[PDB]
Design a protein around this nucleic acid. Structure first.
Lengths: 501, 86, 205
RNA sequence: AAAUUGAAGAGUUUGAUCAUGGCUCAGAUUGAACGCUGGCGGCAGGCCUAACACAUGCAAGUCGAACGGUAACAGGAAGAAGCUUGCUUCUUUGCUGACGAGUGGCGGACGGGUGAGUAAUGUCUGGGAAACUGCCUGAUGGAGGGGGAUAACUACUGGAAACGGUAGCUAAUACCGCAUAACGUCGCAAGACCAAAGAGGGGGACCUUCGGGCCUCUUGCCAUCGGAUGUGCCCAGAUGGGAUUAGCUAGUAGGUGGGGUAACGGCUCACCUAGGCGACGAUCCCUAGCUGGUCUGAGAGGAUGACCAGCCACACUGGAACUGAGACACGGUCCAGACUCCUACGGGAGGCAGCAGUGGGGAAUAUUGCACAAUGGGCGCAAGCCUGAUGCAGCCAUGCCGCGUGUAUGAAGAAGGCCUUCGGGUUGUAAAGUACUUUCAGCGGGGAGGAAGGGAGUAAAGUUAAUACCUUUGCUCAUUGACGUUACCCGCAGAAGAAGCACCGGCUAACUCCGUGCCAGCAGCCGCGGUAAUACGGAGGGUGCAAGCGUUAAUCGGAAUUACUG
């Protein structure tokens, strides 16, 4: 990074909102692709960057879905981009997910331009959007707050001409700083694991430069680049600070996002990469000692000790950190759920072994079973379930948890009976003569013995016997007899409450 | 096949195969006629058949369909047997 | 790859002068020569049989400036060679260029001579040799190259040399700053309070 | 002259002893890993695990001097014109330098990968007799006269693709008769029978149908007997363990005859005999590629079979043959299986144990690099084209070897630290200071060798009608290096950018203080830890190694502790 060379670049733009403003539609129409609703779920659960060539100059587009679950993706996408766009619908207005995107725009000090998505529907009006978002300091219009609004059809494909112009201008009015040659650096969009290609990452390069021989260092991972891939293009020789290019040949799957810096030699970068691992490992053992010692007691003070374990491996690195945060949101005091061994991709022997030791569900956002993986899963009793969307996953884990519970709250009473004139029996130690005042008494149904409104004893009937008949059922207002084991003292005036479950 | 010439070789070897098959089937036919005469006890039919067979087991040897030694045994063997009867 | 620390410590531990300084000074006016280094130098070592063998090998190594790996390889070669192994070890050491440069008086110490060698100030047969362990042969002529000839270290080095006993197997012309390795030194040429057979014993067990 | 001329013991049972006997250590070695640390270079090594699965590129082509040929680009041309009258753009025509697709030839059986299978259609040693063998090679002769086809292409048509369907039509060194036919095959012999192909370079009278004839040389084709190399086959010995496996065997063992192979042979079939193997280990079970050699050992042995070289076996799994001199074919074919990819849903496609690279497994093993310049392989008359063989480069202290991280001087011997009986000792000539050097790294400058050849001309010989051509050998001219910023040499700047690791109770080189108090902890073996701990942890000091040092794993040694030597 020497010479202080300043060259203009294509602005990187991210788009945020409440789900359903047709945020994806804006991109696909410009891209003339329409990959929307071609994928499972009908919505975009993943992040990707796509550069297009349109007058004037060059521009690239980035998009992140807006959901309660993706706390991290929208936070990282804002700070990386020079310009942020916020989609808003006149029918939808403002929503708590959209205001969440407002904070990401201001805290990242990134200038913002917006577009009205629906001009097609007659019940949709712009004035509603402007005024209601007026209250918030963001999105002023012609009040001297320099922000500009755009009205697009998004279905009609109507300009757009204005939105595009604003974006170009907004990037034009601010000085565009970059360099064509120098020390390469940037951030990682999304990383995942491939079977043939190996571990890969999608990287935005702040300073644009690359070469097959150049050594690159991403986080605590290091390595030489074997090959370069750009979008549909299978191979690219050179990559500029503007257009994003998928990086390949790194040692292992890096963090979901971080700062990446190339180096001259790999040997010099080996010690640095190992140094970052030591710190990350030291804090890992540090946070491990605290959480265990935090209770300051050998066990839990109450009965919440019952928990459920899960095993998760997702193909993409961006999800495992992001959805886990949303997976910890569904956690409750009663039943505690925890993730064990989050994977970078697929499935493996040591992963199936991990679920073998402790009973757990093995789930993946997207995964396929390995040849060696099937043998283990099919042999021992386990469960392999893959889910296209995170919503179907977040629901069933909860379902697993709800089932875990075992509460008996009664529990409607089957019958209520009062006992009188106790008799003695060798087997049960006592037989309490009874008279059923209400309902029908049954054999295997549980009972609640109470005296003066408080419960003296509890249990389940073992023998229901009237005379020498020993009938399994006794109706109300019919003389009845009762005895139970582990009940020492029979007193008159108390009432026994039997209830079905 | 994957390589350009490998493709071509498979085509050529099939042609050769159908060529060789045809000539080879013909040859065995003319050999079999001699053994059939022998098994019926006729000198003349078997000598006659041997004379038709001779030039073609010889020729197919020259043409690489069989080796010289094979042609010779056939002539040696049949000649042995036909003489042993008449 | 070289011992760079304090030098008189080594002499003090081995109980003898190892000639690691020029000799301009009585060594006893530079250190407590007759006492080992450290808090417990005054302490006497009631020294095991292994101990005496170790220290003798260290002594020779520290004289010639050789670390263990190379010195062990020197033993191996002495052993392989014909004739007495102990004597062969000392022939090999005494044939090193850094050593020969020292004995012709071009360097005040073997350390200084070694620097002369490494820094391309020494030629063998008018050819530049810059590796210290270069084995010098009978009839070889080692010389200070023209450009290194005006170095004041060399003049001083030759003066001191003139005051040491003069080695038989070398013919040195102080004016030309060239000299001739006439022959391998005999055993009788070398100091008699070196106990090679101890070193030979250490490396056979 | 020399070339196995070589061999160590220590700790630990006991109160102590001698013996017995195991455990443990000092040593060499490693395709190593991990922990701390890490400057340069030369040479080597680098998936030991999953013969697990593989995206993408590349790893086998080449010849227009066999052939019909033009579709690309390149000129050339009657004739169209760019025309500003020698510069030219396009319409045309293979006219030719070349060359996509096609037929044809030679190579795809080599080179490269792996060790799954195999205790024997293996390997090693040593021998046999019944055989084939492309290219290269010696010998002697042929190379005559014909015939019917076909891809390409053309027309019509089906497919999403892969790839097809009709009918035309044409060439050859493709293919087949006919002749010729022995020092060949069959046969006692008499006799009977078998092949082939052209293509180029140059040219004197001579001339035509201007194609060439004809003259000449090169080269390819056919036959037969040899050489050389390769391969097939047979016998003997040796080449792991187990009896908690003792009996095994119907093509089984042999004989006759037919068939079969390139060839001997139960190789195969019919018939006949009733044999054949086995305690000198058969059968069955477990394991395994064998060797040269490698490591260790004084030796005898023990352990072992990466890297290099020889043999074998395999090529996703099971089976099969076709072509061919050679294969039952590593990037060929067919069937079945397992699996994966493409699809417009009807159908298609593929096999990294080649080189990179990916996922997976693992404590762990590299770049999707450059070049055919060199050696070597394929094709070609050559030029040349192809060559992940190979030469090189990148990565990793993985190992071996070399060198540096300065040299010399520097004393009451400072400050600080540490111990101390407060006298002093030590760190320590160490540091600071003083001169001095500049390897290596940095930066500029210059510059071997790996290069032999091949190309134009020229001259001489052998050729021949010939000074052509061809080929050989001299001559000159201009040229060919991926590595490469090469090795190496000169110059510049300044000690400047380059020291860590383990150990210090005995075995075992290296001792003190403070902290702790049978705790926290150490520990190869003995054994340390409850108030003086040289054994824990820190410090100062010291010992041993040093770009490494330790720990773990592993073979042999010591172990005369499987003892043949002993």
């Amino acid at each position: 990074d020497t010479g202080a060379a300043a060259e203009p670049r294509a602005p990187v733009v991210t788009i945020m909102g409440h789900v359903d403003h047709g945020k994806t539609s804006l991109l696909d129409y410009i891209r003339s692709t329409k990959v929307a609703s071609g994928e499972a779920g009908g919505i975009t659960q993943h992040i990707g960057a796509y550069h297009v060539e349109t007058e004037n100059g060059m521009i690239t587009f980035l998009d992140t879905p807006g959901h309660a679950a993706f706390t991290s993706m929208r936070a990282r996408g804002a700070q990386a981009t020079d310009i942020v766009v916020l989609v808003v619908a006149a029918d939808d207005g403002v929503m708590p997910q959209t205001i969440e995107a407002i904070q990401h725009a201001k805290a990242a000090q990134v200038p913002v331009v917006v577009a009205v998505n629906k001009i097609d529907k007659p019940e949709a009006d712009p004035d509603r959007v402007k005024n209601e978002l007026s209250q918030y300091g963001i999105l002023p219009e012609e009040w001297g707050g320099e922000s500009q609004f755009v009205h697009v059809s998004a279905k009609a494909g109507t300009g757009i001409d204005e939105l595009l112009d604003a974006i170009l201008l907004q990037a034009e009015v601010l000085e565009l700083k970059a360099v064509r040659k120098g020390m390469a650096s940037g951030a990682v969009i999304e990383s995942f694991l491939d079977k043939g290609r190996g571990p890969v990452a999608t990287v935005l390069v702040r300073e644009g430069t690359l070469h097959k021989g150049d050594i690159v260092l991403c986080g605590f991972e290091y390595g030489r680049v074997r090959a370069m891939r750009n979008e549909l293009g299978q191979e690219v020789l050179e990559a500029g600070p503007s257009i994003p290019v998928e990086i390949l040949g790194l040692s292992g799957v890096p963090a979901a996002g971080d700062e990446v810096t190339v180096v001259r030699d790999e040997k010099k970068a080996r010690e640095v990469a190992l140094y970052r691992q030591g710190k990350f490992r030291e804090v890992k053992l540090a946070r491990q000692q605290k959480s265990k010692l935090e209770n300051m007691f050998a066990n839990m003070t109450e009965g919440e000790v019952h928990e459920v374990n899960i095993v998760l491996k997702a193909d993409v690195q961006g999800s495992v950190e992001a959805i886990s945060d949303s997976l910890l949101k569904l956690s409750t005091d009663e039943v505690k759920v925890k993730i064990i061994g989050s994977g970078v991709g697929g499935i493996t022997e040591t992963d199936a072994t991990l679920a073998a030791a402790s009973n757990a569900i093995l789930v993946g956002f997207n995964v396929r079973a390995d040849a060696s993986a099937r043998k283990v899963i099919e042999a021992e009793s386990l469960d392999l379930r893959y889910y296209s969307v995170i919503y179907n996953l977040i629901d069933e884990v909860k379902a697993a948890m709800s089932g875990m519970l075992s509460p008996e709250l009664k529990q409607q009473i089957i019958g209520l009976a009062e006992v009188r004139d106790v008799f003695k029996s060798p087997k049960f130690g006592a037989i309490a003569g009874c008279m059923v005042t209400e309902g029908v008494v049954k054999r295997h149904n549980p009972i609640r013995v109470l005296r003066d409104n408080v419960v003296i004893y509890e249990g389940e009937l073992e023998s229901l016997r009237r005379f020498k008949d020993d009938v399994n059922e006794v109706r109300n207002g019919m003389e009845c007899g009762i005895g139970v084991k582990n009940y020492n003292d029979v007193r008159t005036g108390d009432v026994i409450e039997v209830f079905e479950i | 096949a994957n390589i350009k010439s490998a493709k071509k070789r498979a085509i050529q070897s099939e042609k050769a195969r159908k060529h060789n098959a045809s000539r080879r089937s013909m040859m065995r036919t003319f050999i079999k006629k001699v053994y059939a005469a022998i098994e019926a006890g006729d000198k003349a039919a078997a000598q006659k058949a041997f004379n038709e067979m001779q030039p073609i087991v010889d020729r197919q040897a020259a043409k690489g369909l069989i080796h010289k030694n094979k042609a010779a045994r056939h002539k040696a063997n049949l000649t042995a047997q036909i003489n042993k009867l008449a | 790859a070289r011992y760079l620390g304090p030098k008189l410590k080594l002499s003090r531990r081995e109980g003898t002068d190892l000639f690691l300084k020029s000799g301009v000074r009585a060594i006893d006016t530079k250190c407590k020569i007759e006492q080992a280094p450290g808090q417990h130098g005054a302490r006497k070592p009631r020294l095991s049989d292994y101990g005496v063998q170790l220290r003798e090998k260290q002594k020779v190594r520290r004289i010639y400036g050789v670390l263990e790996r190379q010195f062990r390889n020197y033993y191996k070669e002495a052993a392989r060679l014909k004739g007495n192994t102990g004597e062969n070890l000392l022939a090999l050491l005494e044939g090193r260029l850094d050593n020969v440069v020292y004995r012709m008086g071009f360097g005040a110490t073997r350390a200084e001579a070694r620097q002369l060698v490494s820094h391309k100030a020494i030629m063998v047969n008018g050819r530049v040799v810059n590796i210290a362990s270069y084995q010098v042969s009978p009839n070889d002529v080692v010389s200070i190259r023209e450009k290194a000839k005006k170095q004041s270290r060399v003049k001083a080095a030759l003066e001191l040399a003139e005051q040491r006993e003069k080695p038989t197997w070398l013919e040195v012309d102080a004016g030309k700053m060239e000299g001739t390795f006439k022959r391998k030194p005999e055993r009788s040429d070398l100091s008699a309070d070196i106990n090679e057979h101890l070193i030979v014993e250490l490396y056979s067990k």
